[PDB]
Design a protein around this ligand. Structure first.
Ligand SMILES: CNc1ncccn1
Length: 165
């Protein structure tokens, strides 16, 4: 199971790790993807997770969108975890770089509550443009299930831990 995590709260844990390497090591029940509404896994966490699946995540995602249409910002869907996890919970946080409402970040984190344990990145962080310190605060104030956060950037990981209230 999960090793080397710093415990932030009763249910939130954090580690400086590449979520792809972490998923391959742990093979958790659920890995969270930082998805967009179209499930186009081009860059950031999504591009990295999809590349680790040899594009199988994108092929599955395109079939999901062809059948169901796009997700909502703040929404999610459960798909296969491929070689990374049992399932992948694709969660759409607001993309501040697209002018999306940062208030939807709490709705995005609420999706985590449907899973007893998850390996996840900080929603709306990275190329999504939100402040990762704010994302961590919404995470700890919204998620009640056990969430193991992987923060790729060491400098950001240190800043998140050192500034955690
Ligand atoms: C590419 N891996 C990654 N990216 C962001 C957060 C955690 N892991």
């Amino acid at each position: 199971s999960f090793s080397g995590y710093l415990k932030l709260t009763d249910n939130v844990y954090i580690k400086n790790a590449d979520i792809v390497e972490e998923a391959k090591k742990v093979k958790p029940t659920v890995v969270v993807n930082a998805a967009n509404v179209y499930l186009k896994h081009g860059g950031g966490v999504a591009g990295a997770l999809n590349k680790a699946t040899n594009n199988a995540m994108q092929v599955e995602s395109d079939d999901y969108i062809a059948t169901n249409g796009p997700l909502k910002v703040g929404g999610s869907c459960v798909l296969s975890g491929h070689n990374l996890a049992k399932h992948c919970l694709h969660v759409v946080g607001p993309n501040v770089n697209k002018g999306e409402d940062i208030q939807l970040l709490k709705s995005a984190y609420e999706n985590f509550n449907q899973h007893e344990v998850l390996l996840a990145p900080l929603l709306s962080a990275g190329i999504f443009g939100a402040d990762p310190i704010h994302s961590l605060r919404v995470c700890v104030d919204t998620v009640r299930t056990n969430v193991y956060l992987a923060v790729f950037d060491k400098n950001l990981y240190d800043k998140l831990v050192s500034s955690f209230l």
